[PDB]
RNA sequence: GAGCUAGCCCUGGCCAGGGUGAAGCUGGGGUGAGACCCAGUGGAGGCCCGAACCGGUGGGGGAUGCAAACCCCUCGGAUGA
RNA sequence: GAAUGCCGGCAUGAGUAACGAUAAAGAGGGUGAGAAUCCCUCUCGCCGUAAGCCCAAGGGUUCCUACGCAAUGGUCGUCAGCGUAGGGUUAGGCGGGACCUAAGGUGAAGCCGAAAGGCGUAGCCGAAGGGCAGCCGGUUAAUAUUCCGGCCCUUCCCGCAGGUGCGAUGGGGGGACGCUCUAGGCUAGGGGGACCGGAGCCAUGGACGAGCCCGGCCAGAAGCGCAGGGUGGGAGGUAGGCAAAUCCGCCUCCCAACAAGCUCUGCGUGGUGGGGAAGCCCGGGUGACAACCCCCCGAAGCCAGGGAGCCAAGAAAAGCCUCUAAGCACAACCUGCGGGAACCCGUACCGCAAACCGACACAGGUGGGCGGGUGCAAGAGCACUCAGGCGCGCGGGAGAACCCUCGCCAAGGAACUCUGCAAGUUGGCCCCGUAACUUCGGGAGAAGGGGUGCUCCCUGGGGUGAUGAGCCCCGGGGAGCCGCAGUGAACAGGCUCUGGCGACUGUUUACCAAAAACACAGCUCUCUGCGAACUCGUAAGAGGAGGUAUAGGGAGCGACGCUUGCCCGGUGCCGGAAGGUCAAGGGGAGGGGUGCAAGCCCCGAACCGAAGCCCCGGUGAACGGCGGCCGUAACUAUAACGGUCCUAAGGUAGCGAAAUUCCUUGUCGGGUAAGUUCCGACCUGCACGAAAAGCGUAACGACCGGAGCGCUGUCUCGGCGAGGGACCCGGUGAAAUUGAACUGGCCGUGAAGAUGCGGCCUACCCGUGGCAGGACGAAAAGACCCCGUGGAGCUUUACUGCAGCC
RNA sequence: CGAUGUCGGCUCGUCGCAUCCUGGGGCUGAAGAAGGUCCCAAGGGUUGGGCUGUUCGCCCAUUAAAGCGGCACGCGAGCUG
RNA sequence: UGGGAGAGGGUGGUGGAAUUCCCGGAGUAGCGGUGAAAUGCGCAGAUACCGGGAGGAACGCCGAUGGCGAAGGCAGCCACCUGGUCCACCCGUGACGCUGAGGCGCGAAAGCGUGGGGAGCAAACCGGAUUAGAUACCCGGGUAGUCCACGCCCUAAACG
RNA sequence: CCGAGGGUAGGGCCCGUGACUGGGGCGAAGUCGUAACAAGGUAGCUGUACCGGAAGGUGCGGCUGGAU
């Protein structure tokens, strides 16, 4: 049957993209916080 | 005259149709319409705010002069009765001698190739426009202003009118189709003439689908509900009221009054509708 | 977090075939004129039968599954909310 | 040493279940250390509205070639979507961008908000919508509308010639639109040909034939032909299209008009360029100088912005055309021609799936297009089959129980059972025929029955031609033939009588409920005069609605028919300028602290002072409510009638043992041999009753009752048979569970149900297939119950606040 | 209560005997035949339907008879539901 | 052919009196009602009086024992459209007539459907009286309806 | 071939009968009131509508077959 994950690049990149989150308040907190992390990707990697 | 149907299927039982009989141009002018945006009752933060909205046949949207005091003495010519799915009325397309085109809501026995003419020096004839001090007591109108040149606002679906009872000073006193008596200044334009289609009353939808076709959603009953949802929501099996009946967010909805009392519109209205 | 799901908004797409035969129209009858009757024409409908498509009624299987909802048989809608 | 502790390791179950669709395999040859599993050949089977082909998502080298087999692959492996390496994706015309706008997003101006931020006309962004110039064939191991070949085309720049008042982000036109049905002419695609081309074949009894088998086209500028789309022309007036305008709009006159003309598209033809089968030889050569024609069927595609009907009344903006403004008019623009210029990104491969979403090479999920032939009435249904693709990555045997899926069955025929659950029966088309009732539509495919193949003869009409033959379509009549049987296989209603509930089609608890629940047309109450009421938001701003009482919000009821009684004392709502009560504030009689003092400071009576509440009315499709006792009539029984207590007032019509009835299987009637169910009645209604509507109602229902006919392995009552497992051998090889175990019966005992204690009995050691009585067997720190001054959802005339409103 | 699945049915039994039938008896208000009552006796047997979820019970048609109880109101790692 | 009378019919307009309600004024202790009363209304200012407004229905006098129509039935006034009927002339047609089963149309009131309207009245209903009682007669309230449009119903002491 | 009839299925008419139910006629020796006949104590009757233990009442319109 259908499932949950249903990828689409668009729809990635523009809910959890960079420019995404640099809009917002709690969105620059999400990309300071991974950047303290050390996280090698602060965004999700989608093609495009 | 309102159509019926042969009970070929259990909806065409009951349904029944406008005849359409006025309507003489079954295309809209092109410049005087523009796209309608639909809402589904939903407002700029995309909240729901009108329940029930939604999913009715495409529109568009024609411009209708709700002003006419636009062009006083310019007489012009009725060219054509037309349909408006944005209101009971239908609309009817002039011609001015300008050589401007525009649409005003069709009067009750108007007629294609008839001229109207709009002013304080108009006859006194149907789908003339004047102000209200120099139509004569005893004369019903429509298109009504409520203040100088705000626009047309009251009597304006299918069938209404008002009747001019009386003038006091400045103001003249108005029976409004809701029975209220109410004070409206000299200077407010109205046209002569109640609105036509007066049949659209007596049409029956005749089903469900009919209802979505005009964008309105199933309204499920506050009884139909849970207590999470609704004043009237739950008890096991059915349950009457078991309070005073009551609305979505609590308040009571059998005669409760809600016109603000302290409203500046009272000192000019004299009598409250009485049904 | 509405790439699942619910509602709405914008813009596209899909619905084999068969059946029933509303209004209207035309002709004939009828009448003072009519209503109306018959025939032909016509092609309406949350109309009918039935695939795609959308479902999930009853039973059987499955039950450390092929599958954290599946399979078979049967069954509902299928121009419409 | 224990925490159902934590991490890791390793056991048991066990060589056990399983190895993932029951579409299916066999042999020969090759390779190799090794072969059921890789390659090749032949035979067999499966799909073929796909299980084939194309595209879009998504995936991201999985593509091609060489080398390789540790792991991955449910076995094997020499193979591979796996390991290593090398190669592979070519565009002015395909898709997106240097174009347009949609919802929506963003956002000059502007508005709002403690901060963060929230809005916001224009503008901008935003596509699978608009717009825009490429078709056929060849080539690679792997790309091709991209390379090549042929024939076409677009924009930009510059130049030449001719033409014109040129010129725009401004004005106007146009772009530009629904649903259903549909004409004419075509194309795609298809069938046939005694005609054209072709390698060959004569078999096994016959056939050298009008034999069999194969193929008989594709693209193409200008021109031309056919079919369609679009568009009237001239003049005069002009105050409207936020400037101007010769444009457009409006008025008037002339002419033209279902014509033509101009224009545009489709189709055909067309210089030219291609393709080209079976068979046979080793993807390639040959066939071949291949032929490339006639007839029929024919779209849902094209002409198209076609036509008609209908109501629910069906984007925008740019490209384009036209008008003019600044300007500029040696410019500029238009037309023709010529030369030059033409960027960025994608392009492999999978794509109904072993490469996408499902942890897996997972029987599930995944949008668009093509989807041949024959027959069955039609069709994308069904059977078979083409092209093309597969046999589903464990096999080999055996022929037990039992399980699954399937076939048949004597006599009986629902006797089964909660229930005909399940499975039979029926089954398409044509003809005949068809009841109560009904809202006149229907009920209806009611029911029930007849026909159905093939052969010969005669004949009717239509389509295509030409009017004829031919082809194709729809018929009619007569005479025959065969079988158990002619929709001969596959696909394809069992029917009827009668209740309850819901009017109806719809909707729902994704994943235990599809219903009588929700919705629904329709009915009623009520609010709302527009900066509406109401909703969301602190606000600005939005929805309502670019709507205006025939409208919008809220509530109940729920098609329709006939109806909807009585009670306003309590609660609610509505009305009430009196009166009572009423906070801040006003007022300041009188009193107090302190100071020598003027003075400062404090308390404070009358009186004035809103909403609200009290009070007075109204109001039921507002919350709700709608009695009891005694007596009485020629026999009894009962009580129309009287009396009495209470109440705000005492239940009307209609219905009633009911989806409501406790006693209850009430009583009577019906049906049955027999009826706690069902139907019809009665009425002492435990505890119906009128919009939480009452009583009915044709039609409808995968709803829940009761009955009959038909037919059956449901049953008496079981038997046999088939395949997939179970079983045996080779390969690979889990699981929950597990204090340790050397783990029998009885009668007792024991924390009250003992393999484990006592007595007695019985018992050689160890497995394999089976069955489930026990191990208070497994699973899940009980879906009940209580307890905890544990939690959470919900309610209200609990308490206390808050928003909101007054 | 870190779970002992709970009515009825089906299937499969096995046991007790306070015996329904069949076998053996005594008493009788036992003429016979048929009964009544008690005693011995558990070897075997103890039907098919209608109603209802029913256990039970009532009813139909039979029968030699249409027994009553226990086994976690026997039996859901056996089925039903 | 020429005249006549008439509430004959249909449509559109339009006038005044009176009732009720609302507004402004003025005023106060009752009003109303009956056989007599009470309920009701009224100091929250009623009744009575004046001015203004709104709205529905019916048309005083004329009016008669009158007129018209087939019957039902028709009454302010104006206009338009239209029926029947009488008289005079004795001009035209030349028995073209009478009746009329069926059919068709009309048909008071009440009632019904859809939608308006709603002042007065008033079934049902509520209350006060009366009465032995009083589901009545009388009184105070009061919803259908009475009125308009369209469609039904088709009855009557539709009687002379 | 037709064909008595038999079988299957579905209709139409008539008769008898039925738990129960509706009113009617008669009986008369009862209970309740007194609706009509007199102005019958509210003149009567009437079509229709709504209502009431019952006769009946009321509304709307009609008749006189109404006393004074
Ligand atoms: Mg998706
Ligand atoms: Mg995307
Ligand atoms: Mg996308
Ligand atoms: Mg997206
Ligand atoms: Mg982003
Ligand atoms: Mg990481
Ligand atoms: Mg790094
Ligand atoms: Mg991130
Ligand atoms: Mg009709
Ligand atoms: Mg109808
Ligand atoms: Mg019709
Ligand atoms: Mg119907
Ligand atoms: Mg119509
Ligand atoms: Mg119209
Ligand atoms: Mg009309
Ligand atoms: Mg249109
Ligand atoms: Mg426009
Ligand atoms: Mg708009
Ligand atoms: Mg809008
Ligand atoms: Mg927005
Ligand atoms: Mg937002
Ligand atoms: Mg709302
Ligand atoms: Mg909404
Ligand atoms: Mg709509
Ligand atoms: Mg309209
Ligand atoms: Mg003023
Ligand atoms: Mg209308
Ligand atoms: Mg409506
Ligand atoms: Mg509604
Ligand atoms: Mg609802
Ligand atoms: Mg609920
Ligand atoms: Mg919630
Ligand atoms: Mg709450
Ligand atoms: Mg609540
Ligand atoms: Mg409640
Ligand atoms: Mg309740
Ligand atoms: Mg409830
Ligand atoms: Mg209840
Ligand atoms: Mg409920
Ligand atoms: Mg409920
Ligand atoms: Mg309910
Ligand atoms: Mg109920
Ligand atoms: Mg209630
Ligand atoms: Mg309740
Ligand atoms: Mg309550
Ligand atoms: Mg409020
Ligand atoms: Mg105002
Ligand atoms: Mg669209
Ligand atoms: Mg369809
Ligand atoms: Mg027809
Ligand atoms: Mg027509
Ligand atoms: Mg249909
Ligand atoms: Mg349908
Ligand atoms: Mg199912
Ligand atoms: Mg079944
Ligand atoms: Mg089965
Ligand atoms: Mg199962
Ligand atoms: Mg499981
Ligand atoms: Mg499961
Ligand atoms: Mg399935
Ligand atoms: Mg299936
Ligand atoms: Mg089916
Ligand atoms: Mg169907
Ligand atoms: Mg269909
Ligand atoms: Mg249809
Ligand atoms: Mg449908
Ligand atoms: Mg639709
Ligand atoms: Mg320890
Ligand atoms: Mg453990
Ligand atoms: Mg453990
Ligand atoms: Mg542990
Ligand atoms: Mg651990
Ligand atoms: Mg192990
Ligand atoms: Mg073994
Ligand atoms: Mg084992
Ligand atoms: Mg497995
Ligand atoms: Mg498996
Ligand atoms: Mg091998
Ligand atoms: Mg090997
Ligand atoms: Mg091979
Ligand atoms: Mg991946
Ligand atoms: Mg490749
Ligand atoms: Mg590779
Ligand atoms: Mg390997
Ligand atoms: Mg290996
Ligand atoms: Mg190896
Ligand atoms: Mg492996
Ligand atoms: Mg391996
Ligand atoms: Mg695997
Ligand atoms: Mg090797
Ligand atoms: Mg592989
Ligand atoms: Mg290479
Ligand atoms: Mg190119
Ligand atoms: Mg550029
Ligand atoms: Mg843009
Ligand atoms: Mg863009
Ligand atoms: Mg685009
Ligand atoms: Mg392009
Ligand atoms: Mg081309
Ligand atoms: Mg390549
Ligand atoms: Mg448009
Ligand atoms: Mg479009
Ligand atoms: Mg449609
Ligand atoms: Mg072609
Ligand atoms: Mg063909
Ligand atoms: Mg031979
Ligand atoms: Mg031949
Ligand atoms: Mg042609
Ligand atoms: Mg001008
Ligand atoms: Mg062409
Ligand atoms: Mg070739
Ligand atoms: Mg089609
Ligand atoms: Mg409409
Ligand atoms: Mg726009
Ligand atoms: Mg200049
Ligand atoms: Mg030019
Ligand atoms: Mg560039
Ligand atoms: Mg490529
Ligand atoms: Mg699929
Ligand atoms: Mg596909
Ligand atoms: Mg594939
Ligand atoms: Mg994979
Ligand atoms: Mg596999
Ligand atoms: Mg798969
Ligand atoms: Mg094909
Ligand atoms: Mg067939
Ligand atoms: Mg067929
Ligand atoms: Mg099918
Ligand atoms: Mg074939
Ligand atoms: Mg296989
Ligand atoms: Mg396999
Ligand atoms: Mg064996
Ligand atoms: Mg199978
Ligand atoms: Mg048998
Ligand atoms: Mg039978
Ligand atoms: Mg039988
Ligand atoms: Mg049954
Ligand atoms: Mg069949
Ligand atoms: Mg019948
Ligand atoms: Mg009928
Ligand atoms: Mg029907
Ligand atoms: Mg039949
Ligand atoms: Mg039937
Ligand atoms: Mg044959
Ligand atoms: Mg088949
Ligand atoms: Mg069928
Ligand atoms: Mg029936
Ligand atoms: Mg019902
Ligand atoms: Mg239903
Ligand atoms: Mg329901
Ligand atoms: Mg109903
Ligand atoms: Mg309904
Ligand atoms: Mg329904
Ligand atoms: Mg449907
Ligand atoms: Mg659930
Ligand atoms: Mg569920
Ligand atoms: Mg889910
Ligand atoms: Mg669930
Ligand atoms: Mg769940
Ligand atoms: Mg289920
Ligand atoms: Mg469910
Ligand atoms: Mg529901
Ligand atoms: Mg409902
Ligand atoms: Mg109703
Ligand atoms: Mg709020
Ligand atoms: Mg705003
Ligand atoms: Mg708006
Ligand atoms: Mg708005
Ligand atoms: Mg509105
Ligand atoms: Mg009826
Ligand atoms: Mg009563
Ligand atoms: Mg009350
Ligand atoms: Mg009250
Ligand atoms: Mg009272
Ligand atoms: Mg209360
Ligand atoms: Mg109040
Ligand atoms: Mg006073
Ligand atoms: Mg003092
Ligand atoms: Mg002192
Ligand atoms: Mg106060
Ligand atoms: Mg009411
Ligand atoms: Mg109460
Ligand atoms: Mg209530
Ligand atoms: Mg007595
Ligand atoms: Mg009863
Ligand atoms: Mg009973
Ligand atoms: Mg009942
Ligand atoms: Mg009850
Ligand atoms: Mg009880
Ligand atoms: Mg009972
Ligand atoms: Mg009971
Ligand atoms: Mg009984
Ligand atoms: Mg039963
Ligand atoms: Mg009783
Ligand atoms: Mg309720
Ligand atoms: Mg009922
Ligand atoms: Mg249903
Ligand atoms: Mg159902
Ligand atoms: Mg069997
Ligand atoms: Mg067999
Ligand atoms: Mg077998
Ligand atoms: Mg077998
Ligand atoms: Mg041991
Ligand atoms: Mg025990
Ligand atoms: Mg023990
Ligand atoms: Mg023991
Ligand atoms: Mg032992
Ligand atoms: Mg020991
Ligand atoms: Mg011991
Ligand atoms: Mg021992
Ligand atoms: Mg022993
Ligand atoms: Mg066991
Ligand atoms: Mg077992
Ligand atoms: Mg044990
Ligand atoms: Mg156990
Ligand atoms: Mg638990
Ligand atoms: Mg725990
Ligand atoms: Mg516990
Ligand atoms: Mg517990
Ligand atoms: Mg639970
Ligand atoms: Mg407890
Ligand atoms: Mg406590
Ligand atoms: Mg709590
Ligand atoms: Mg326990
Ligand atoms: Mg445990
Ligand atoms: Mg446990
Ligand atoms: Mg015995
Ligand atoms: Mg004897
Ligand atoms: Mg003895
Ligand atoms: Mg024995
Ligand atoms: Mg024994
Ligand atoms: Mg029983
Ligand atoms: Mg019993
Ligand atoms: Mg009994
Ligand atoms: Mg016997
Ligand atoms: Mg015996
Ligand atoms: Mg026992
Ligand atoms: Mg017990
Ligand atoms: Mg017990
Ligand atoms: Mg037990
Ligand atoms: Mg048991
Ligand atoms: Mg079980
Ligand atoms: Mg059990
Ligand atoms: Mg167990
Ligand atoms: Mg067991
Ligand atoms: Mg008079
Ligand atoms: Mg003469
Ligand atoms: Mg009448
Ligand atoms: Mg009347
Ligand atoms: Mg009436
Ligand atoms: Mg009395
Ligand atoms: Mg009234
Ligand atoms: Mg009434
Ligand atoms: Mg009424
Ligand atoms: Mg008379
Ligand atoms: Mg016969
Ligand atoms: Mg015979
Ligand atoms: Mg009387
Ligand atoms: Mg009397
Ligand atoms: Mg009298
Ligand atoms: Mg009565
Ligand atoms: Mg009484
Ligand atoms: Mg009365
Ligand atoms: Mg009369
Ligand atoms: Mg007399």
């Not at chain 2, 003489?24 to 009108?50: D, F």
């Not at chain 2, 009457?240 to 009392?261: D, H």
């Amino acid at each position: 049957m259908k499932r949950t994950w249903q990828p689409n690049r668009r729809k990635r990149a523009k809910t959890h993209g960079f420019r995404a989150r640099m809009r917002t308040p709690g969105g620059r907190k999400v990309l300071k916080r991974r950047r303290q992390k050390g996280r090698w990707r602060l965004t999700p990697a989608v093609r495009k | 005259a309102v159509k019926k149907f042969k009970p070929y299927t259990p909806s065409r039982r009951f349904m029944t149709v406008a005849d359409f009989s006025e309507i003489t141009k079954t295309e809209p002018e092109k410049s005087l319409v523009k796209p309608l945006k639909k809402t589904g009752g939903r407002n700029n933060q995309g909240r729901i705010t009108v329940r029930f909205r939604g999913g009715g046949h495409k529109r568009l949207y024609r411009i209708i002069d709700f002003k006419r005091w636009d062009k006083v003495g310019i007489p012009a010519k009725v060219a054509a009765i037309e349909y408006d799915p944005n209101r009971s009325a239908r609309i009817a397309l002039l011609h001015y001698v300008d050589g401007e085109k525009r649409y005003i809501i069709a009067p009750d026995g108007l007629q294609v190739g008839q001229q109207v003419v709009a002013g304080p020096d108009a006859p006194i004839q149907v789908g003339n426009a004047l102000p209200l001090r120099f139509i004569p007591v005893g004369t019903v109108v429509h298109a009504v202003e409520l203040e100088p040149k705000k626009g047309a606002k009251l009597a304006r679906a299918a069938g209404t009118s008002a009747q001019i009872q009386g003038r006091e000073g400045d103001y003249v006193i108005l029976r409004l189709p809701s029975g209220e008596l109410r004070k409206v200044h000299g200077e407010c334009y109205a046209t002569v003439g109640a609105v036509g289609n007066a049949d659209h009353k007596n049409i029956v939808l005749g089903k469900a689908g009919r209802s979505r076709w005009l964008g309105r959603r199933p309204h499920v009953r506050g009884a139909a509900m849970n207590p999470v949802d609704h004043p009237h929501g739950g008890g096991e099996g059915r349950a009457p009221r078991g309070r005073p009946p009551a609305s979505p967010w609590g308040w009571q909805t059998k005669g409760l009054k809600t016109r603000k009392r302290r409203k500046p519109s009272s000192r000019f209205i004299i009598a409250r509708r009485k049904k």
